[PDB]
Amino acid sequence: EEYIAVGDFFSTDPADLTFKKGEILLVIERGTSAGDGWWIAKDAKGNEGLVPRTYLEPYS
Amino acid sequence: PAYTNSFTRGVYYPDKVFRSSVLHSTQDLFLPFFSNVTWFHDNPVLPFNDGVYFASTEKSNIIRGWIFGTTLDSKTQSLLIVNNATNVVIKVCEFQFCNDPFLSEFRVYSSANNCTFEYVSQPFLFKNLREFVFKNIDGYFKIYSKHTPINLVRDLPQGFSALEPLVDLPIGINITRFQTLLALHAAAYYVGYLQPRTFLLKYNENGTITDAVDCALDPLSETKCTLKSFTVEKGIYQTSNFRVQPTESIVRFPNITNLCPFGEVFNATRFASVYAWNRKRISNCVADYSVLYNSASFSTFKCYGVSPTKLNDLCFTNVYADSFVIRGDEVRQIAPGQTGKIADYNYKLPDDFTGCVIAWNSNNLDSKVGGNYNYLYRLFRKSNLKPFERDISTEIYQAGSTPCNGVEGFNCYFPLQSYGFQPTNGVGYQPYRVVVLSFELAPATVCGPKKSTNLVKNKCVNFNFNGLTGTGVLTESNKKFLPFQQFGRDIADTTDAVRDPQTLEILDITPCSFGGVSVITPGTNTSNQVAVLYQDVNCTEVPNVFQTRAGCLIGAEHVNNSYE
Amino acid sequence: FELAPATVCGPKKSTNLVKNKCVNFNFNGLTGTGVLTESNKKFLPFQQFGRDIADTTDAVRDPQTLEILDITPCSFGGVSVITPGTNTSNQVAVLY
Amino acid sequence: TNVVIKVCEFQFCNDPFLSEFRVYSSANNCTFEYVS
Amino acid sequence: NAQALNTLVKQLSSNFGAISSVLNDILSRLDPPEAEVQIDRLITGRLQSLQTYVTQQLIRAAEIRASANLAATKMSECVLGQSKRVDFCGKGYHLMSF
Amino acid sequence: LQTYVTQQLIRAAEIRASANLAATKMSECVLGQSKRVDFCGKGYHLMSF
Ligand SMILES: *[C@@H]1O[C@H](CO)[C@@H](O)[C@H](O)[C@H]1NC(C)=O
Ligand SMILES: *[C@@H]1O[C@H](CO)[C@@H](O)[C@H](O)[C@H]1NC(C)=O
Ligand SMILES: *[C@@H]1O[C@H](CO)[C@@H](O)[C@H](O)[C@H]1NC(C)=O
Ligand SMILES: *[C@@H]1O[C@H](CO)[C@@H](O)[C@H](O)[C@H]1NC(C)=O
Ligand SMILES: *[C@@H]1O[C@H](CO)[C@@H](O)[C@H](O)[C@H]1NC(C)=O
Ligand SMILES: *[C@@H]1O[C@H](CO)[C@@H](O)[C@H](O)[C@H]1NC(C)=O
Ligand SMILES: *[C@@H]1O[C@H](CO)[C@@H](O)[C@H](O)[C@H]1NC(C)=O
Ligand SMILES: *[C@@H]1O[C@H](CO)[C@@H](O)[C@H](O)[C@H]1NC(C)=O
Ligand SMILES: *[C@@H]1O[C@H](CO)[C@@H](O)[C@H](O)[C@H]1NC(C)=O
Ligand SMILES: *[C@@H]1O[C@H](CO)[C@@H](O)[C@H](O)[C@H]1NC(C)=O
Ligand SMILES: *[C@@H]1O[C@H](CO)[C@@H](O)[C@H](O)[C@H]1NC(C)=O
Ligand SMILES: *[C@@H]1O[C@H](CO)[C@@H](O)[C@H](O)[C@H]1NC(C)=O
Numbered sequence: 024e025e026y027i028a029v030g031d032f033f034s035t036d037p038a039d040l041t042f043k044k045g046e047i048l049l050v051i052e053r054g055t056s057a058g059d060g061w062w063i064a065k066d067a068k069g070n071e072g073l074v075p076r077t078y079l080e081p082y083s
Numbered sequence: 084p085a086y087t088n089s090f091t092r093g094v095y096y097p098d099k100v101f102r103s104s105v106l107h108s109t110q111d112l113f114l115p116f117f118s119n120v121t122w123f124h125d126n127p128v129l130p131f132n133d134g135v136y137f138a139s140t141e142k143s144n145i146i147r148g149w150i151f152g153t154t155l156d157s158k159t160q161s162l163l164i165v166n167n168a169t170n171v172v173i174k175v176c177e178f179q180f181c182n183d184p185f186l187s188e189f190r191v192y193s194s195a196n197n198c199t200f201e202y203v204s205q206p207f208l209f210k211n212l213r214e215f216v217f218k219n220i221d222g223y224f225k226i227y228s229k230h231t232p233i234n235l236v237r238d239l240p241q242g243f244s245a246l247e248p249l250v251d252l253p254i255g256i257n258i259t260r261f262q263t264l265l266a267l268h269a270a271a272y273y274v275g276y277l278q279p280r281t282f283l284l285k286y287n288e289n290g291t292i293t294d295a296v297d298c299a300l301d302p303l304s305e306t307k308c309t310l311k312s313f314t315v316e317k318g319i320y321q322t323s324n325f326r327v328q329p330t331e332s333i334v335r336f337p338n339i340t341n342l343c344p345f346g347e348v349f350n351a352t353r354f355a356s357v358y359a360w361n362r363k364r365i366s367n368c369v370a371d372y373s374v375l376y377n378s379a380s381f382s383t384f385k386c387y388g389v390s391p392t393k394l395n396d397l398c399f400t401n402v403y404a405d406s407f408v409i410r411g412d413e414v415r416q417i418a419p420g421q422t423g424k425i426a427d428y429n430y431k432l433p434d435d436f437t438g439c440v441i442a443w444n445s446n447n448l449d450s451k452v453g454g455n456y457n458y459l460y461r462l463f464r465k466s467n468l469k470p471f472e473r474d475i476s477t478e479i480y481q482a483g484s485t486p487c488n489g490v491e492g493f494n495c496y497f498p499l500q501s502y503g504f505q506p507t508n509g510v511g512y513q514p515y516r517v518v519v520l521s522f523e524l525a526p527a528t529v530c531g532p533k534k535s536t537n538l539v540k541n542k543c544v545n546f547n548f549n550g551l552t553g554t555g556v557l558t559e560s561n562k563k564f565l566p567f568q569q570f571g572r573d574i575a576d577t578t579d580a581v582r583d584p585q586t587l588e589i590l591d592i593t594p595c596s597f598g599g600v601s602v603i604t605p606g607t608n609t610s611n612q613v614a615v616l617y618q619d620v621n622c623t624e625v626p627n628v629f630q631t632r633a634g635c636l637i638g639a640e641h642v643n644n645s646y647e
Numbered sequence: 648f649e650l651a652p653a654t655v656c657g658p659k660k661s662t663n664l665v666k667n668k669c670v671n672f673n674f675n676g677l678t679g680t681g682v683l684t685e686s687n688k689k690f691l692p693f694q695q696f697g698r699d700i701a702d703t704t705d706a707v708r709d710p711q712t713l714e715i716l717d718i719t720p721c722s723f724g725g726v727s728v729i730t731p732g733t734n735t736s737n738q739v740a741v742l743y
Numbered sequence: 744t745n746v747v748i749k750v751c752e753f754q755f756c757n758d759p760f761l762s763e764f765r766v767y768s769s770a771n772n773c774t775f776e777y778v779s
Numbered sequence: 780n781a782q783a784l785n786t787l788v789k790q791l792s793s794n795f796g797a798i799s800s801v802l803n804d805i806l807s808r809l810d811p812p813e814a815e816v817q818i819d820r821l822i823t824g825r826l827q828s829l830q831t832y833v834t835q836q837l838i839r840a841a842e843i844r845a846s847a848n849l850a851a852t853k854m855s856e857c858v859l860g861q862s863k864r865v866d867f868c869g870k871g872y873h874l875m876s877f
Numbered sequence: 878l879q880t881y882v883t884q885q886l887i888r889a890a891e892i893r894a895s896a897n898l899a900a901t902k903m904s905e906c907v908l909g910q911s912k913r914v915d916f917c918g919k920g921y922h923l924m925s926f
Binding site: 552574575576577 | 792
Binding site: 364366367525 | 773774775776777
């Protein structure tokens with residue numbers, strides 16, 4: 024299930040990733056137990072980090 | 084090291100076309116005349132730099148080939164060329180580098196594993212003087228050669244020699260450096276370089292390039308290219324133009340950063356709770372976001388829909404700020420599209436929130452012994468809160484069907500509960516001071532302070548004043564401006580006077596020097612010396628110099644005596 | 648097959664030539680229309696075609712024969728009609 | 744002594760005038776404020 | 780002459796169908812792959828303006844040359860000597876001209 | 878329109894040259910006698926109307 028980012032989000036936190044519009048990411052397991060409303064997705068370089076739940080939308 | 088002067092060599096046929104008794108100008112890679120050429124007599128690696136000119140000395144056969152490529156190692160494939168006087172081997176295999184490769188022969192062979200492209204051809208050819216030009220453009224490697232028996236082996240002989248193409252090879256990979264090959268059983272050779280320089284070529288009846296000139300070497304040769312002739316007659320000729328480029332690119336702006344305090348909303352002693360978050364209007368004030376980045380105190384400085392770098396150059400109005408107290412564990416609840424307990428009943432962020440959230444710990448001030456029971460929150464609500472809404476109400480929850488008449492019971496569940504922030508609480512339960520800034524797009528948005536680069540005078544300097552920009556020399560002005568003008572236009576919508584508001588001192592603006600350069604010559608056959616003329620330019624920045632009413636000219640001496 | 652420059656393909660058509668006729672020609676890379684005839688100029692062994700002025704090709708050495716030929720655009724221009732007057736007479740003479 | 748700019752929600756008056764500040768009908772829900 | 784140069788300057792401010800009349804704005808806020816489209820309609824307009832000025836300039840140059848030749852002719856006859864031809868230099872019988 | 882104006886100017890220029898020539902013939906060959914030969918009619922010119 025590929026997901027497309029509708030906008031650009033900035034992260035200060037060392038736990039988190041940087042994404043822009045049109046970036047391709049791979050969805051990971053839904054074991055959201057570290058924090059509520061937090062999702063993890065892979066980036067082009069493969070680094071993993073927490074990202075906002077609303078920052079991504081379901082592709083179709 | 085041991086530079087040598089290439090008098091006229093370094094020319095080759097730009098194409099396989101035929102021209103007879105006609106002068107044609109071609110723009111291609113070339114070696115400028117009288118250009119320094121590195122001389123080795125010793126075999127170190129040399130860079131390619133988009134074309135290499137090679138010339139071996141006579142009475143020698145030590146040189147046997149060249150190796151081209153990017154790294155000449157196991158990482159990237161590299162081109163190998165070796166000539167053994169009977170055949171040429173062209174490998175694009177994976178070859179390692181060598182400390183001192185040489186040839187007894189075939190010693191340069193380090194590794195031939197993983198051969199990508201393979202090619203084999205036949206050899207090309209007081210003694211002959213070998214000259215070769217190598218270039219790689221459009222993925223094609225071209226080889227040029229010409230053997231001319233001459234004398235004066237110590238230096239490059241004068242004269243002319245047109246290099247012809249022999250072989251085209253479709254290598255197609257980037258080449259940045261190469262290395263010559265010597266046979267050990269010291270030779271002298273010269274290495275040049277090429278750049279996109281324009282030459283003029285002369286073709287005889289048989290279509291052989293007998294002579295050529297450079298279009299940027301000297302003013303005399305400058306006129307030849309534009310005149311398409313070698314013998315320019317006695318006269319004055321305009322050959323090109325000139326100008327002066329900007330140097331500093333200064334920018335001036337208004338006396339600034341005086342306005343918009345944020346300590347009253349960031350460093351205020353008292354902040355409201357989450358159930359009574361305030362929304363104060365912030366507009367028409369100059370906010371400096373740079374100081375926030377280097378605060379070294381925030382913990383959840385996250386920006387949604389915007390980046391910290393791009394919110395300074397461009398900004399939006401509607402800077403409503405929300406301040407409230409949130410415990411450390413539930414800080415993440417405050418985000419667009421994020422639901423929960425606090426995000427659902429106290430403060431909900433709408434989707435597509437073009438703003439940032441700033442939070443920092445407040446253990447040393449937002450806590451007291453015995454528990455800080457001063458901050459309250461909404462624990463229960465009948466319906467979810469609409470984003471950006473404050474619900475100040477004393478209505479109590481309705482868990483069951485039996486209504487509550489103000490008396491608390493088993494199903495009333497008074498929503499308002501007070502937080503507990505003891506000094507010994509855990510990091511997750513620590514009350515982190517958090518503020519929220521919202522940006523949306525009323526005209527006349529207000530952004531942060533500008534560059535304010537220091538100015539300069541009497542120099543062609545680019546300027547970008549407030550709204551208006553241009554390039555020109557800045558100087559003092561005797562003109563007077565009324566107190567409600569920022570710049571002035573002489574005529575035909577041409578700005579000629581801008582007052583720097585910071586200094587409040589009107590300054591004239593004029594385009595800096597330019598015009599057409601001309602060459603004065605007495606005739607090609609009559610003499611060789613030429614004089615350069617500049618038109619309508621103060622003779623202080625153009626480069627015997629004589630200043631005249633039509634600008635100054637270089638190469639002539641003023642004479643009081645008057646002649647025809 | 649996948650796509651290093653200078654790809655190499657199938658053998659070229661190489662059709663026969665014709666002289667002294669306005670004929671389209673398509674050599675190895677260049678093509679045009681003109682009359683082909685013998686030439687007196689001599690090409691060096693490394694040229695393919697030749698031009699004289701304003702990038703006008705006039706001599707092409709066919710690779711198949713290794714011979715040099717002159718190329719000229721075939722006859723064209725404006726045709727004019729000579730008449731003595733409609734009322735004076737009717738016959739007219741064509742002028743090329 | 745000063746000029747006050749209210750873009751607030753102000754009701755109409757039959758005969759507004761100024762004793763001063765009589766024209767103040769309603770200042771609720773102020774949107775933009777400016778003083779010079 | 781003054782207006783012919785003057786009228787050329789305003790042509791720089793002409794949009795010629797482009798969103799901006801200045802080169803800097805076009806090079807700033809346009810995607811370079813499609814930026815040349817606005818430039819092309821601007822170069823043609825500016826080139827057309829320059830073409831008219833030169834062509835119009837040449838027309839006056841021919842007129843001036845005709846005037847200069849006439850002035851030279853009057854110099855040849857009515858200055859360097861006496862003009863026998865009638866009503867060529869001043870009404871009445873001509874003696875000389877200074 | 879550009880061509881029409883440009884063509885008009887060329888015709889206007891040569892007409893002006895013709896007008897100046899016509900004015901010249903008026904000054905010499907009408908208002909007086911043109912001693913210059915073959916300027917107004919073949920032969921020894923006397924006068925013109
Ligand atoms: C060429 O090299 C010589 C000696 O290194 C030096 O004096 C001269 O200025 C150089 N000229 C150029 C054009 O590099
Ligand atoms: C040769 O190098 C290419 C580089 O792309 C690599 O894909 C290939 O696996 C290599 N094969 C061998 C046998 O080294
Ligand atoms: C050569 O350099 C260009 C410049 O970016 C690059 O796009 C290309 O992939 C390079 N090719 C090789 C073979 O190094
Ligand atoms: C041209 O070549 C012919 C013979 O190949 C020779 O006789 C003649 O001198 C040459 N002319 C020039 C200008 O090179
Ligand atoms: C708040 O105080 C801290 C600590 O002195 C300081 O670093 C920061 O710049 C202040 N911010 C404001 C808006 O006053
Ligand atoms: C503003 O004006 C004062 C008055 O002299 C001056 O000292 C200061 O440098 C000015 N600031 C700027 C940014 O020009
Ligand atoms: C240069 O050529 C001109 C033109 O033929 C001639 O008048 C003049 O005498 C020549 N001067 C010399 C030094 O050959
Ligand atoms: C050229 O500029 C200098 C100052 O750099 C000035 O003294 C001189 O008068 C100027 N010359 C002219 C002709 O204006
Ligand atoms: C020429 O005139 C200048 C200016 O008056 C004067 O300084 C100079 O001595 C004169 N003689 C020469 C040879 O320049
Ligand atoms: C092609 O080369 C061969 C080589 O023997 C020759 O016999 C043949 O005549 C050549 N073709 C033409 C058209 O001349
Ligand atoms: C034809 O018409 C012309 C012009 O009117 C006239 O001069 C000529 O005599 C005519 N010829 C005949 C045969 O009618
Ligand atoms: C104030 O007016 C705005 C206009 O959009 C409205 O949305 C808001 O609910 C109003 N608030 C109050 C308290 O009247």
